[PDB]
Amino acid sequence: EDLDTDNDNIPDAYEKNGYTIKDSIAVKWNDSFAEQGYKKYVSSYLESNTAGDPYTDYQKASGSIDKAIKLEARDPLVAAYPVVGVGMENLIISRATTNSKTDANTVGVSISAGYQNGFTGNITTSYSHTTDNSTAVQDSNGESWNTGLSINKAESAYINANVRYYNTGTAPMYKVTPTTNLVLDGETLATIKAQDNQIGNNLSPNETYPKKGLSPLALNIPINYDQLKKLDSGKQIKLETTQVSGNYGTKNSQGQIITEGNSWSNYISQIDSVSASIILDTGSQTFERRVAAKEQGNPEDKTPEITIGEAIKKAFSATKNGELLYFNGIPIDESCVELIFDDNTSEIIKEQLKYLDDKKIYNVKLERGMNILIKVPSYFTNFDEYNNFPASWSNIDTKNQDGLQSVANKLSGETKIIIPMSKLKPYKRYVFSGYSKDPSTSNSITVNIKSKEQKTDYLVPEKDYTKFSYEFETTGKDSSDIEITLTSSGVIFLDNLSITELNSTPEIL
Amino acid sequence: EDLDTDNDNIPDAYEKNGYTIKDSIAVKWNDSFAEQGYKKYVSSYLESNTAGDPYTDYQKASGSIDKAIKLEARDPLVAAYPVVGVGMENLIISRATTNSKTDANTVGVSISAGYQNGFTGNITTSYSHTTDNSTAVQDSNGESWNTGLSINKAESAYINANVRYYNTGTAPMYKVTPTTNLVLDGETLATIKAQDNQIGNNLSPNETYPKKGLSPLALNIPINYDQLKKLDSGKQIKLETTQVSGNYGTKNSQGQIITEGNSWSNYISQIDSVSASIILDTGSQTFERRVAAKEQGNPEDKTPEITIGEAIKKAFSATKNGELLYFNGIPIDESCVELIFDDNTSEIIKEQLKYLDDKKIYNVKLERGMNILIKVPSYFTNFDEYNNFPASWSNIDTKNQDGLQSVANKLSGETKIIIPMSKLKPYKRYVFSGYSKDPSTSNSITVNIKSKEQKTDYLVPEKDYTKFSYEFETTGKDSSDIEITLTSSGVIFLDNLSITELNSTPEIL
Ligand SMILES: [Ca+2]
Ligand SMILES: [Ca+2]
Ligand SMILES: [Ca+2]
Ligand SMILES: [Ca+2]
Ligand SMILES: [Ca+2]
Ligand SMILES: [Ca+2]
């Protein structure tokens, strides 16, 4: 029982059934290690680099790699992979702006009344990655760009951009040389590549170049009246990185760290073709991960098969407290977040859910080629231990034990919540979602939402818990508050209420 | 029985009679492996690189190569070979366009009434590859380029192109540097080569640079009145890549992946001279493959000999369901697609068909220097399990068992089909093809096709099944529908009806 088919210092049996690294040697997994902090690693016994990255299974598991690599990349099934993009902070034509890395994913999402057959996720038509950045101009107050830039039919150029690089991956990049396009709708103004002074020497995960506390970088554009007025009328300019060139660190025979000749492009296509892509957006910081998966046809592919929940826990270092995952305290269970899939992933999940008795997305096996996006709600209450809503709900009755997880709220009457506009970002699309149950299957619920327009909807709860979602929008920072009223004709059980922010509606100057 | 003449870790006997890779070692083929997913590999025992590519037979069969290489390139008889071309998406002189990679092959194809001696294919005079790209300008509506570009005898230049690279091969290319010519009829405007910013760092098969969801690349042209009016009058500009330079990945002694010094041009001429070329066009995506073949003179050439159907199955990973091949569900049997050959391949197939009792193209041996193109029909019905026609046929009688494969349609009267123009691309040439049989050899069929011009033809079915083809054209998106009527004087058996799109007719502004 010491065979090593792939020659990476881990025996086949340990690599097949579970192992952990102690004193820099692989040992067989024992269930008593879990309380001591030891993690259970499983990988392929026919391949030395299971995930497709520059580091083998033993190097990743034992930590004999760059110490700037995230700890969740020490799992052989999670790839060490940089995700580097560029985003602008100032637009000079003299007005600031913000950037969003998950707007393109969300724009092509349509929200309906309810969900069928236990599939509580959502489908997007324009799935994209965190490197596709869309900037929203702040502090406008209906001041068109033409005021002070008087133009009739001239292409006067005079636009300046202050960019900053970001890394949402698990590995650092060295000698970062990005290539970007600044496009408004479909017009490629230029293909600008960092020549010699906009090269970042190093860029750690969750960090920017230049680091926080430094002025944004400036890289060095003609613009005509047509696209200028397009920008003036409900359009946001976008900055997309087509490619980034950079290096990774490895040890010499002398023990030094080198990055020259260690191009990250030698591995990008291999990693992207042997794994599934997952994105987590907590509302302030975004993470993108690649998790290795099996190809269905090959009988000689020995990559371990794990579920979606196991993949999420391994990739984002979530903590399993009982049966639910927590990311730094934020609940990220399938009933506490918003799950967005492309068409193929949604079809696969729907097909697999027919034969699954649990009817949970997190119990569906993970397959390569998938694309998953998790949106953590801006506000979420479950009536059990977590409530981050700015204003407490009215008529709250927690004296129940029939909740989705622990307890529920007994709706006998009406529940109204008020939200000041200062707690929400202006010109955004939001979704209010929840789970409802009517054991008698006789009662009905009316939902009234006060927004830029008044909305009223009617839903009939079923015997068991079902999910409902309703969308609304916000207009202007200096406007009225948001009122949400849920009224029931009888007794209803409510649980897992949340409000999450979707993409931003157009700004009309 | 352990000889290894070529020293590639596969014994001569296994390599001669059939082998498969299990636990990273070669084992003798057994017929009981087929249901377990194992493929049967055969190669040459006198050469380590049977197909001529950078990877040996053992590396390809065992998968010890780049994980971005397609699985069908793991067969030693199918080469790992990039096919990189360039195609434009926007033409600015302010109007969009589309690209076609198989128009040049199809333009030189003449369609006749019937086929003789069991040869159901077609002959082309201008066979070309997927790197020869012809663009068709969309959304014209008879608006000449001179309107707004008023020119009498001046060469005012002012043309802009937005290009995008594509890969139809089985292997990725690294550091892509294409060289292209933008030519209208025979005028070489310039020989433009990607200098420093239009270099794609990596380009996987079935993918583009920049990837889908990114703005098209712009590379940086004088044009005179003569060729401008030529373009105005029924001419489409073409963009041909003369050569592309790029690299492939290989493993170090340290186990890293390197692409520097690994030029793809060291192998192009060798692969092209030791193989046959096959192209498959499903109507939306196109694939080009090279399959190794034997040279006739050499008695010391040990390359295995396979038929055309075996070559197609190996090259495109088709599935043999019974006796017919399916490509992702699309039937690609010789009676369900359009086969186009150049002159030499057609002559060889005709010569070999004389001694073949089966009289099938797919049973003819494959030889090097061949050139095969497969066009999947836009619409196809076989009355057995597959029918993707937009509108169901009239007077359908499937109560028969005398079909070409399973059942046929009994024509006693007339069959009429209507096709809305929204289901067809305007300004295109189409072919309606089918198989007919008259056991009594007494009846006759009249075919009436309503198109830009009204066409009527008469055919006399033979005792057994024979193929008929009739061509027509479409004009304008906003026009009348297409009517096809087949009328029989008696009882006829019809099977395998299809409509396939040929090249595009000239556009007159
Ligand atoms: Ca091992
Ligand atoms: Ca391994
Ligand atoms: Ca609860
Ligand atoms: Ca051998
Ligand atoms: Ca060999
Ligand atoms: Ca049939």
Indicate the helix (H) or strand (E) that contains B314: helix B308-316
Cβ–Cβ gap B68/A269 under 8 Å: yes
Starting at the earlier edge strand, list the strands of the sheet with B286-292: B122-123, B338-341, B371-375, B275-281, B286-292
| CA B23–ligand 2 middle distance (angstroms) | 13
Q: Token pair 């092959």 is at which residue?
A: B105
- The sign of the dihedral angle between the CA atoms of B294, B296, B300, B304 is positive
Cα A382 from Cα A403, distance rounded (Å) = 9
Distances from the Cα of A426 to the Cαs of A103, A452, A469, in angstroms? 15, 11, 20
Cα A388 from Cα A336, distance rounded (Å) = 13
A8 is in an annotated binding site: yes
Cβ atoms of A145 and A224 within 8 Å: the answer is no
Residue B322: partners with Cβ closer than 8 Å, 6 or more residues away: none
The one-letter code for the residue type at A215 is S
**Tokens, residue A131:** 């490197």
A384 is in an annotated binding site: yes
Indicate the helix (H) or strand (E) that contains A352: helix A343-353
Cα A399 from Cα A405, distance rounded (Å) = 14
Within 10 Å of residue B284's Cβ, how many Cβ atoms?
Answer: 6
The b-or-e profile of B363-387 (16+ CB within 10 A means b, else e) is bbbbbbbbbbbbbbbbbbbbbbeee
**Tokens, residue A445:** 């619920």
Q: Among A26, A77, A72, which Cα is nearest to A49's?
A: A77
Q: What is the DSSP string of A250-312?
A: EE-SSS-EE-TT-BTHHHHHHHHTSEEEEEEE-SS-EEEEEEE---SS-TT--PPP-BHHHHH
B328 interaction partners in chain A (CB closer than 8 Å): none
Q: Does B174 touch chain A (CB under 8 A)?
A: yes
A373 CA to centre of own chain: 5
Cα A289 from Cα A271, distance rounded (Å) = 11
Q: What is the DSSP string of A56-85?
A: -HHHHHHT-S-TTS-GGGGSTTB-----EE
Q: Among A263, A212, A219, which Cα is nearest to A241's?
A: A219
Q: Does A274 touch chain B (CB under 8 A)?
A: yes
Structural resolution in Å: 3.0
Length of chain A: 509
Strand partners, A165: A86, A209
Indicate the helix (H) or strand (E) that contains B313: helix B308-316
Maximum alpha-carbon separation in chain A: 81
Cα B109 from Cα B257, distance rounded (Å) = 45
Cα A51 from Cα A66, distance rounded (Å) = 17
CA-nearest residue of chain B to A269? B68
Looking at residue A365, what DSSP letter applies?
A: B
Indicate the helix (H) or strand (E) that contains B58: helix B57-62
Q: Among B454, B443, B455, which Cα is nearest to B494's?
A: B443
Cα A49 from Cα A8, distance rounded (Å) = 9
B36 interaction partners in chain A (CB closer than 8 Å): 299
Q: What angle do CA A256, A248, A84 make, to 5 degrees?
A: 150
Cα A167 from Cα A81, distance rounded (Å) = 10
Cα A472 from Cα A485, distance rounded (Å) = 14
Q: What angle do CA B371, B377, B381 make, to 5 degrees?
A: 135
Q: Is A351 exposed, middle or buried (0-12, 13-18, 19+ CB in 10 A)?
A: exposed
Q: How close does chain B come to A451, measured CA to CA in Å?
A: 33
Binding-site residue positions of B: 4, 6, 8, 10, 12, 15, 44, 47, 57, 382, 384, 405-407, 495
Within 10 Å of residue B67's Cβ, how many Cβ atoms?
Answer: 20
Q: What SS3 state is found at B433?
A: strand
Distances from the Cα of A256 to the Cαs of A69, A73, B360, B497, B507, in angstroms? 17, 22, 65, 69, 65
Within 10 Å of residue B463's Cβ, how many Cβ atoms?
Answer: 10
Indicate the helix (H) or strand (E) that contains A47: none
**Tokens, residue A3:** 């065979």
Conformation bin of residue B369: beta by default, left when phi > 0, alpha when psi is -120 to 50: left
Indicate the helix (H) or strand (E) that contains B401: none
**Cis peptide before B390, with omega less than 30 degrees from 0?**
no
Cβ atoms of B157 and B258 within 8 Å: the answer is no
Cα A186 from Cα A179, distance rounded (Å) = 17
| CA B181–ligand 3 middle distance (angstroms) | 66
**Tokens, residue A57:** 């299974």
Torsion, Cα B303 B307 B309 B314, to 10 degrees, reads -10
| CA A46–ligand 4 middle distance (angstroms) | 22
Q: How close does chain A come to B438, measured CA to CA in Å?
A: 44
Q: What SS3 state is found at B266?
A: helix
Cβ–Cβ gap A242/B174 under 8 Å: no
Q: Among A484, A399, A396, A411, which Cα is nearest to A443's?
A: A411
A128 interaction partners in chain B (CB closer than 8 Å): 213
Helices (H), B144-241: 225-232
Torsion, Cα A55 A56 A59 A65, to 10 degrees, reads 0
The one-letter code for the residue type at A199 is I
B202 interaction partners in chain A (CB closer than 8 Å): 265, 268-269
Q: Does A193 touch chain B (CB under 8 A)?
A: yes
A457 is in an annotated binding site: no
**Tokens, residue B135:** 């663009």
Indicate the helix (H) or strand (E) that contains A133: strand A132-137
B260 interaction partners in chain A (CB closer than 8 Å): 261
Cα B60 from Cα B76, distance rounded (Å) = 6
Indicate the helix (H) or strand (E) that contains B288: strand B286-292
| CA A70–ligand 2 middle distance (angstroms) | 20
**Tokens, residue A235:** 């359009």
Strand partners, B447: B457, B486
Q: What angle do CA B444, B449, B451 make, to 5 degrees?
A: 165
Q: Among A407, A384, A410, which Cα is nearest to A397's?
A: A410
B66 interaction partners in chain A (CB closer than 8 Å): 269-270
| CA B46–ligand 5 middle distance (angstroms) | 6
A221 interaction partners in chain B (CB closer than 8 Å): none
| CA A393–ligand 3 middle distance (angstroms) | 15
Q: What SS3 state is found at B89?
A: strand
Judged by its nearest atom, the ligand closest to the C-alpha of residue A403 is: 3
Per 3-state DSSP, chain B is made up of helix, strand and coil in percentages (nearest 5) of 15, 35, 50
Q: Does A250 touch chain B (CB under 8 A)?
A: yes
Strand partners, A321: A324
Q: Does A240 touch chain B (CB under 8 A)?
A: yes
Q: Among A314, A364, A362, which Cα is nearest to A336's?
A: A362
CA-nearest residue of chain A to B258? A266
**Tokens, residue B154:** 């001046």
Binding-site residue positions of B for Ca(2+): 4, 6, 8, 10, 12, 15, 44, 47, 57, 382, 384, 405-407, 495
Output phi, psi for A28, to 5 deg.
Answer: -65, 140
Q: Among B19, B50, B45, B46, which Cα is nearest to B368's?
A: B50
Facing residue for B174 by CB, picked from A56, A190, A265:
A265
Q: Find which of B215, B219, B251 to mutate to test the A interface (most A CBs within 10 Å of its CB).
A: B215
A371-375 and A338-341 as β-strands: parallel, antiparallel, unpaired?
antiparallel
Maximum alpha-carbon separation in chain B: 81
Q: How close does chain B come to A221, measured CA to CA in Å?
A: 15
Q: Does A245 touch chain B (CB under 8 A)?
A: yes
**Tokens, residue A236:** 């946001």
Looking at residue B153, what DSSP letter applies?
A: S
Cβ–Cβ gap B215/A262 under 8 Å: no
A338-341 and A122-123 as β-strands: parallel, antiparallel, unpaired?
parallel
Output phi, psi for B271, to 5 deg.
Answer: -65, -45
| CA A243–ligand 2 middle distance (angstroms) | 30
B174 interaction partners in chain A (CB closer than 8 Å): 265-266
Q: Is B340 exposed, middle or buried (0-12, 13-18, 19+ CB in 10 A)?
A: buried
Q: How close does chain A come to B210, measured CA to CA in Å?
A: 6
**Tokens, residue A417:** 């919540």
Cβ–Cβ gap B215/A240 under 8 Å: yes
The one-letter code for the residue type at A197 is N
Q: How close does chain B come to A367, measured CA to CA in Å?
A: 16
**Tokens, residue B14:** 């296994």
Q: Token pair 């907590």 is at which residue?
A: A282
A84-92 and A25-28 as β-strands: parallel, antiparallel, unpaired?
unpaired
Q: What is the DSSP string of A417-480?
A: EEE-GGGS-SS-EEEEEEEEE-TTS---EEEEEESSSEEEEEE---SS-EEEEEEEE---SSS-
Cβ atoms of A269 and B204 within 8 Å: the answer is yes
Cβ atoms of A171 and A73 within 8 Å: the answer is yes
| CA A272–ligand 2 middle distance (angstroms) | 19
Q: How close does chain B come to A481, measured CA to CA in Å?
A: 37
Q: What SS3 state is found at B365?
A: strand
Q: Token pair 């302030």 is at which residue?
A: A284
Cβ–Cβ gap B256/A250 under 8 Å: yes
Length of chain B: 509
Residue A436: partners with Cβ closer than 8 Å, 6 or more residues away: A445, A459, A461, A465, A466, A468, A492, A493, A494, A495
CA-nearest residue of chain B to A192? B197
Q: What angle do CA A87, A93, A94 make, to 5 degrees?
A: 75
Indicate the helix (H) or strand (E) that contains B10: none
Cβ–Cβ gap B257/A273 under 8 Å: no
A285 CA to centre of own chain: 9
Q: How close does chain A come to B66, measured CA to CA in Å?
A: 7
Q: How close does chain A come to B204, measured CA to CA in Å?
A: 7
